[PDB]
Structures are given as C-alpha cells and as structure tokens.
C-alpha cells in the first residue's frame, strides 16, 4: 500500500476548498456529513466532546468518502498531536498559536526525528495501516499538513513571524475567539473586526501560505472566497441540526 | 417521588402534538432535538441503530426537557417491551400490528400481572427510580401509553378489530411501509394511498382512539392536522441534518 | 488449559450460597460487588439495562475474584442463551419458565449437539478461551448449570413436571413476579404468598433440585436459609446504593 | 449517489472468493482485517459478542476497503435481519436454516413489500445513505445477497427443497455445527463427515447455487476450492491472534 | 432559553449545601445519586475513571434533577477546563492549587476574553445549548462558579494570597491529600491535622469566601457544619456501595 | 485484602520476563493476549488509541490471569500517572525520559506525600479496591514499579544521571525512536545503532537497574536475552494479527 495521499494539502495550492465543521462527536454523524460532498470536514477536538478514540471512529467513517478530514486538537499539546497523527489524522488545525517559537514546535511535533519530535510507533498505528504501508516512516512527513489558528491579540502581534515558519501550511482565522479577543465577543460582524480579518487574510496569502476561515454567514463566506481564501468552512453540523429542527417546528408552533 | 406524569398520553384527548423523529441514535443528538420544543420525540428502535442501552442514554438526555419521549421497539416483542418499560419509556409505538389478538398481547405486555404480563423488577428499574417512586407497582399502568402501527394490508383488513382493543390508545400510520404494502413503494403521495390514509384516520378517530402519522411534507402534515390527527411527526433528524448540509453546500458547490 | 470449574454448580449439593443481585449494568460496578465475597453474583439481563456486550464486560471484571457469575437472560430465547454461553456464562437463570416442555428446551439450549441444540463456535468464544481450552467441546456441558424461575400460576401449575426435567439443576422463586401473579403485586409479605413459597421450596428440595430465592428482608432470607434453600440472594446493588445514599442524606436533611 | 454495488454477489457466478472470519467484534480490529485483501470478511453476529451497533462500526471501518462484508446474524430473526439491512449489510449468512419454508421466509425478510416483508425506513438508514441514494427503494433488492447455513440433520434432510428456493444465492456448510450434529463434535476431519460435506457441495453447485465453507485447515480449504466451492473462508481472526501469540511465546517459553 | 441558573453558586452565600461524591463514573450511577436529593453532586475527574465524554453523560443524567453538578478536573489544565465548561459544567473544583498566580490563571480559564482566556465555541457547546441560549456569550461568566482545593503545605503557605484572588468563590479542603501532605497519610483524624483544618476554614470564611470539605465521618461532618462550612460532602458513592454490600454479607457470612 | 503483589517488580531481580505489546486497545483483545502465558503485557497508552477508561477495561480483563500488566502513558504527565495508578496499574513505562530531573519527578509522581506527589484518593480507586485493601495508603508504594524509556540523544547524554536516580527500577530501550533519533529511522538493524543499544544495556545492568527492550526479530530478542536483559517484549498484537492474516491469504492469493 502507498501512504494515503493528502488531497487537502495539495489542494491548498490549486483550489478553494469548502468545509463543514463536525462537532456531533460521533462516527455515525461524521458519516452523514461525509456523504454530502464537502472538500473537508473539521473534526473538532477543541469545542466538541471528542477524545482520541471518538476522533478515530470519525476518521474510519469518513475514510470511505472523498471528503478530507482535518482534526483540531484541544491545544498544541505535543503528545496529543503524536496520538492524532498515529490514528491517521493527516491534517491538523492547532488552536491558539501565538508565536513563531510555538509554531516551529508544532511543525516539529508533526515530523519524525531526527528533523522533528513525532514519537515513532508505526507497527501500532492506523497511520501506517500497522506497517501495511511498507515505507511509512520514510513517506509520512510528505502527506502531513499543519494549520495553525491565530485567535488572540498576541497571535496578531506575531503574525509576520508565524508566517515565516517553514512547515506552517496555513493560518486559519476563527472570527469567534478573534472578535472576543478584540472586545466584540459574539459580534464578529463589526467593521473593526472585519477590517482586521481581511488584512490578516491578505498578509497570510502575501507570505505564500493558505488562509482559512469559518463563517455560517453566506455573504461573509462568499466575500472571503472572493479574496482567494483557500479553505473556507461554511457551516457547523450542530448549528444546522438545531436550526433545521427549530425552523421546521416554527411552521407548526 | 410521585410517578412521572405522561403528558403525551393526557394530551391525546386535549390537543394536537407535533413530533420529531429521533434516529441519530445518540444521547448527545437526542439532547439537541430535546431543546427545540417538539411536543414528542420518537426514539426509533426499529429503523435507527439503537439498543436498550442507547435508548436509555436518550431517555436520560431528553428527561431534563419538556418534550415527551415515545420509543418504537424493533417489533412487538414481549421481553423487549418489558426492557424498554423498565428503563422508563412511558409511551411505546409498536410496529407491524396486524390483528386484535396481537394488539391485546401488546396491551398485556405493558401491564403488570395479574391483569397483564409485564415482568416485575421495580427495585432495578429507572422506571420506579429504583423504588424512589414508592407506589410504582400500584401507579405504573396509569402513565403507560400504547400506540400501534398499521402498515400492511392485513392490518387494514383488521383495523376495526384493532380499534375495539381496550388499551390501544392510538394507531399510527407510517405512509412508507403502507405505500410499499399497497404497491407504491417510495410514492406515498399517490391518490390511491392518500384516500386510504384519510379513511383510516377518520375510522381511528370515529372509534375514540388517537390517530398519528409522520410526513416531512409540510402540505400533507398540515392536511393531516386539519383532519384532527392527534400526534403528527413533521420531520426526521437524519433527514434534516443531511438536507441542511446538502442545501448549504449547493450555495458554494 | 482445563475448562473453568463451575463451583456454583458443585456447591448446589454441598452448601448454601449467598448471592448479590448485580443490576448496575457496568464492568466497574460488577468489580466492586466482586470484591465483597458473595458466593454468587446475578448479572441481570432481564431487569437491568444489559446486552451481551455489557454482560461480557461484567464477566471479565468478576473473573479475577472467587464470586461465581450467574446470568439471567431477558427470556428463554435459544439464540440469546447460545450467545451468553459463548461469552463464558456457565450458570444461567431462565425467567418465566412455565412447562416441562419449555424446561426441556432450555436444557437442550445449554448442551451441544447431538444431545442438545447449543450452536458450535468454540474457535470464537471466550467460553473455550478461543480453543486455549483444548477439549472444550468434550468438557463444556459438565460445567454448565441451568436454573429456571417459576414466577406465574402456570409455572406453579406445572411445578412437579418441571421438577422431573433432567438437567434443570435448580428452581429459583422470585417473590416479585409471583406475588404479582397471585394478586398481591408489591406485597410478597402476605401469608397467602409466603405459604406458597415455603411449600414450593419444600417440593423443589424433595425432588432433589436446588431451591433459590431473593429477599432483601433479612428475616425472610434467614427463614429461607433455615428451610435449607441452596441459593439465596440477600440484596440488590441498585437498592443498596440508593438506600445507603438516602439514609446518609437523612442524617443532615 | 448510486447504491453500493454488491461485488460479493456478482463474484458468486464469476470467481472463487477467499474469506476471513471477523469475530474480534471491534471496528479497529475489523479495519486491520480489511487491509489484508480478503475477497470477503464475515462479521459474526452469532458466535462473537456483536450487536447491531458493533456491526455498524465494523461496516463503517471496512467500507473504505475493497473487502466485501458478509454479516451472520445470531438467528433467522426477521426484525434483526431488517436492522442489519438498514445499517447497510448487503450480504447476510443466516444460521441454522432447516426447511424450504424457513428459507423462503429469509428471502422475503430481505425484500421490500409488496414482494417481501423488509420494513421500509430509508430516510433513517445508512443502507440508503439517509436517502442520498435517491432510487434506493427501487434498486435495493438487486444488491442484496442471501446465504443460508445448513448445519443440522434436518437441514440435510431438506437440502433439495432449500436448493429450489428462488432468492437463496448460496448455501454455506459450517463443519463445526455439522460434525457435531452428525455425532463427531470437534472432529469434522472424519471421512463420514467429509463425504457428506463433498456430496452437499456437489448438490449445491448442481442446483446452480453458490457453495460456501470455512476451514482453517489449508489442505481441506484447497480441496474445497478444487471442487469449485464459490466462497471459502480460510481462517478466523481470534484463532490467528491466539495461535500467532502462542507460537511466538513457545520460541522463548 | 435563558442560561441555566447556577443555584450552587447562589447558595454559597445563603445556606449550607450537603454533597455526595460521584466516582462510579457512569451516567446510570450518576442518575441514581441524582434522585436522592443532595444539594450538590461532585463528578470526580481526578480520582475516578472519567474523561470529558463520561462527565458529559453524567451531566445529562443529573440535569433532569434539582441536585447541582460540580466537576473536579484531573488538574488545573486550562484546555481541559475549556472542555468541561463547554459540555456545560457550571461549577469546577480545581485540585492542587498552591499560589495566587495559579488561582488567578484558573479564574481567567473560566472567563471569556477579553477578561479571561476561555476558548470561544458557543455554536458547538451544550453550555450554550448550541446557541439556543441566545445571549450565552454575554451571560455565561455570571453562572460560572470556581472552587479551588488547598491540599499541600505550599497551598497552606499561600492561603491568604489565594483568598485575596477575586473570582475564587470557594476553597475546598480535602483531608486525604492534606493529612498525607502533613505526614499523617490515611489518618486525617489526628488533632494536629484537625486544628489546621479548623483554622483554614476560619480563615476562608473570614476572607468572605465559601469553605468546603469532604468527610464520611458523621461527627466530623456535623462539626464542620457547626463552624458554618458552606459546602460539605458527607459521603462517596463507591464507599457507600462497597460498605453497604459488606455490611449485608456479614449478616450471613 | 492484602495489596496485589507486583510479581513483575520482584522478577526484575530473579529472572528474565518475556513480554507482549498490547495495542489492540480493547478489553476483549487484552484478554486473548492474557491467555497465552506472557510474563508481562504492555498496555500501550502512547502509540495505541487508549485512554484511562480503555486501559481500565484491559486491566480488568488481564487481572484474572497470571500475566503482569505494564502501562505506557502517552507522556510523563504527573496527573495522567496519578490516574493510571488509581485504576490499579502497578508498573508504568514512561516514554521520552531525558534527564535525572525528569526521572526524579516520575519517581515522586508514583509515591504518596510526603515523600512523593501522587494525589490521594483511595476511597475511589480500584488500586485500593475502594478501601477493601485496608492498609493501601501504607503499602501502595512497595508494589509500584517505575520504568523509563531512553529514546533520544539527550536521554543517552543523561544515561549515567538517570541511572543514579533511586526509584527508577528499569530503563527500557525502544529501538524505533532511538534508531530514528540517531538518523536511521526505520532501520534499527544498523551496527551503529546496535552497538549503542548493547553498550546502553551493559551500563543499565552495571548500575543495578533492570534493562528492557522490544524486538519482533527473534535473533535480536535472543541476543538481548543472552546479554541478561531483564524484560524483553518479543512481539506486538497488532503486528501478529496483521502478519498472520497476510501470510494466510498468501497461500490462496
Ligand atoms: Ca473515552
Ligand atoms: Ca450495545
């Protein structure tokens, strides 16, 4: 078997990928999402009740389908990154990255020694298909994609430095934490926040990195796609489920 | 503690209850549904991957919310009915009921001896809250509601007889199995099927029993509510999740 | 490896075994109960929210401890009995046994062909420890113990017939279903019910079979032990947990 | 989406398919087995500790791989068959089939009304991918494959009658139950048993049905393949795990 | 929906709240404990085998009942605190707090930016009921309650400094870790230890914070209540289950 | 009850113990491995998809069998070590230990105050069998065994310093991470790497500590046993399963 090709990673340089946030934290819900045809599915280990084993179950469901999996761990924790890579997550979105130093450590956490600090356990891991991918330890690094989130004043204060870190493939901007960090908690729609988001996306793309964002607002999503944003999540499973059920009940109250 | 009051059962004689089909088979998804404000939630043990333990998890989630739980077991299996009552399901929807004899057996399956054949295990059961409901074995039968589904030619051929069974509180008509039994599999919208559904609802209400139905079609749902149908399910969680995600992706293809 | 000796089965003829009801339906709770020193633990598949997989987890917990496991399936279902024997349950308590014809079928359900109808699948089963017990298909039947419950008027109407079935090792009387069946639901304490229980125990022992019963009432339990009742369960984990927490809160209200 | 093509079913008429028994009852173990390259994987609901939900997880794992899933339910239970088809099992192996009448009922259990008695619930089912397979209710029957097991003297006494049942695609012979039924429990190797197996395979293929068998004995397996047996399982995951670990320890004792 | 009112937090200033430790690590066991009537239930993520998902299940169980949930995470880990607040835990008990600096970080961990460092993910969280609590991001901080444990000499050496931290609502003293830290491991009953506990409770209440403690000793528990201690846990589910089962067996040996 | 004797710990000074790696992450698979007769089983929390709850299930499975359990946590995390000791893991293998300062912290993490920093919670823990081991807080430390892994240049740079830490019972060398760290990723077989392994084993034994290693290569494993290596793991469950299934399929292609 040749290593699973990371089409998400390749597509960062060739197209704009449309994404769905997967927070229902369940192999069955992840499979329903995997049937729709999103370019990428964000399995949320930070804001949904997931652990290594529930994320594994969702990778297995989604694996039969074209949609590429991206895993957001709870934090840039090196051992947890080691766990998620070995279960076969090929793209990670690291929350709350605030310095070049922290971004380089995340690069190392995703690469085998001697170049990085990823723990070696290929015989045991879905990632190597238990060594059925015969050359895994030689070929793994090529198909790993590292994304970091900038979501604080300190991250924005270190944006140019993070953007010069080799091995950061993309910077994702989450309007929720960023709006809140800027003193507009719950109101990312403010001009002050939007101007900072647009400038940030411009700087990201100017430095040759992929820019990413989430917006459930169709107008803002299409605006971010007009700027060339490479990976745009356009909704959240929990929100779509809740709103579709509320909208239906309102027709009957 | 007094026994949990079955408001679904009481409401069969006082209003028209709007329902959501719960087939995501998960305590977390059941809780999202429980927040919307449906009158009733159908926990589907027949067509969703549920077992006694996953149904228990969904009863526990939903229990904090006003929405009344209805459990559809996989079949009119007496021991399985015993299990679902002891985990605290107070309303059951029995699929594929086709005779007075089978309907009376389902009544007995829901009532303690000597009047019925429900196995006695109150010390162990969430239903008695492990005997924290001190009078449970005296008061349980009052708050149990039995619904049966008519979904075959044989059931329609035995409708008058089922409708004279004391302890059948309601007859639910599932257009899917009924359309299929009538040779219009996948097309319940045919006039031949709809005329049979309307006549069936009329006969059900004429015999003093509650009529129920499911339709994701808003026009048919409101038509069934205009006829006085007592319990109408207006959608399905799996369908709302899939369609909301497909509709959103179509705005971006 | 030699097959696990069924000490419960042997002790039916040499001593009186003290039992605890396990309805907390969980490997971790079953292990707590396993530490106490009960002669037997009844893993309740009829009145607690258990399936084959949760019962297997409880057998694995308990296996490190001297306490012998007895499993009560939801009903005398031949395929379910097959499942529970293959996960390694060596003693079964069959609910709701009402005829010699039904007792004989339960005997066959527990014995391999050609003498019985137990499905053969030893390579796969914990019961054979996946063929690490090399002679399992030759030795299995010797260490299987079959108990049946008489809990209905019809059972009591067929008691002499059930007691002449070879391979029924014991008859358990559950006062809850029996009291209910006799029109004293929730009050097994009545003289009418108790006289029937005592006579029933006497007839069971007179026919050379083991008698069993459950009572959380210390006085009744010691009374049943004075009659020579071979297997006596003296409490229920769910009840002890609830009562201990209630008594404790009462000291501080 | 078009319905998943049942390649196992097609190959019954075009090649000889090599199978692995999957009784580790686990999505993770099922995925390891799925990477090997077996033509078919037998998810054992009869002799391994599986339920609908654990079988769903194993289907989801295996779905990303070419290996075709075959599910053996605990028994020819019509409601359980309904449940396994809806989670998306396209091939079923029914244990303990003993008459044409029982085989015909299993055929109907797998087909929608009006031809069959399969309960209709496509909106909810992974089988229809929650109606993302738009024609599912029209196209589903064509990709369903029904195998039955003959494992008793009564089955052998009804073999010609079972073989004339339209819609039985295959008869599988399990030497374990059959050897036991013939009074050679745990010694299927006996000439008396093997002559019966060979004759049975010849009769099955003579009637234009697929023959199937399991043998962990390489010689017997290759013999059955020389007879033209269409589906041959050649080992069992539990057995290969235990034996591989025992062989390794023996090199070091 | 308005945000769940944190009655535990309000009662810290108006009454003395009686608590039960919940370490059976199970939604079913948590629900049994929830029926008793304790003012608060301590879901122990530090000393019972719990993770985010098992704590969520226990929150869902308990939610239908008046008893207030308090969650003890394994350590003052900011990302884990983020995870427990989002699943909807409104009161946290932080183990092993030893400095004002650490207590201030725990305060911030529980509050949204710009005041605190709690990660923003309201669309996904049971805490916001998936934004069905429409003002959640504005109202969430008011219903969050932060308790810290002082259980080391260093903590006692920093007690006045921890007590001056705005946003620490309560200091809990666990005699087990504190007795051990003082060189009396497993004998918190010693006068040297008790004088320290009494003095500590007096200092905590003198600084206008709530004092808390656990003791299974009724006399010590009632003594701590006579001192005005605001939250007193009076037993542990694991201990009451084991002891109740041991006491019962001893009546029969 | 007396505390469980750690035979693994005792045997470090009296014999050479043969080990199997358990990465199938499942109570049912851990029990199959437990039947074989390995001296020790390594429950891998670093490279297999395990959490505290799945490790507890595997400890419960294995506990019925003579094989001693060793747990490898994901990292030398003090709170996680606390969790794993409380579920009853008596031998820990700490990955990625690189200094005497880190080894000493791991020693303290495994010992109660005042000598160590292990959090006290014996009422709640399987480790004390919920205080059924009456003297647990006095006797626990004697039966705890601490192993550390040297797997980096920095570890080898600190080997003499780590080897002088009292309370480090053993140093395990994992050829995978070490080979990788040395610039021979995936080829531990190189003379440069092997010479370092042999010298390392010699230095470990010269300092009075137990040496450990894993090799699936029979020749290397016997070589390590001839040097007197005290604990040698000779295979990996995931690898044996995959290889046994691959070899078997190869006979029939
Ligand atoms: Ca978990
Ligand atoms: Ca289950």
Residue numbers in the entry:
A (entry chain A), B (entry chain A), C (entry chain C), D (entry chain B), E (entry chain B), F (entry chain C): 1 to 253
What does the paper say about this structure?
Here, we investigated a new Class II metal aldolase from the p-hydroxyphenylacetate degradation pathway in Acinetobacter baumannii, 4-hydroxy-2-keto-heptane-1,7-dioate aldolase (AbHpaI), which has various properties suitable for biocatalysis, including stereoselectivity/stereospecificity, broad aldehyde utilization, thermostability, and solvent tolerance. For Class II metal aldolases, the enzyme uses a divalent metal ion (M2+) as a cofactor for substrate binding and stabilization of an enolate intermediate, which allows the reaction to proceed through C-C bond formation or cleavage. Each protomer contains eight β/α motifs of a TIM barrel fold with an additional α-helix (residues 6–11; N-helix) at the N-terminus. Three protomers are associated in a tight trimeric structure to generate three catalytic pockets, and the trimer is dimerized to form a stable and rigid hexamer with 35% buried area.
Ca2+ ion was found abundantly in purified AbHpaI. Therefore, the function of Ca2+ ion in AbHpaI was further investigated by analyzing the enzyme structure in complex with Ca2+. Consequently, by stabilizing the (β/α)2 loop where the active residues Glu46 and His47 reside (see proposed mechanisms), Ca2+ could indirectly aid in the catalysis of AbHpaI. Apart from the catalytic Zn2+, our structural data demonstrates that Ca2+ is found at the trimer center on the dimerization interface of the AbHpaI hexamer, neutralizing the negative charges of three Asp51 carboxylate side chains, which is unique for AbHpaI and is not found in EcHpaI, SwHpaI, other pyruvate-specific Class II metal aldolases. The results showed that apo-AbHpaI is quite thermostable naturally with a protein melting temperature (Tm) value as high as 81.3 °C. The binding of transition M2+, but not alkaline earth M2+, can further increase the thermostability of apo-AbHpaI.
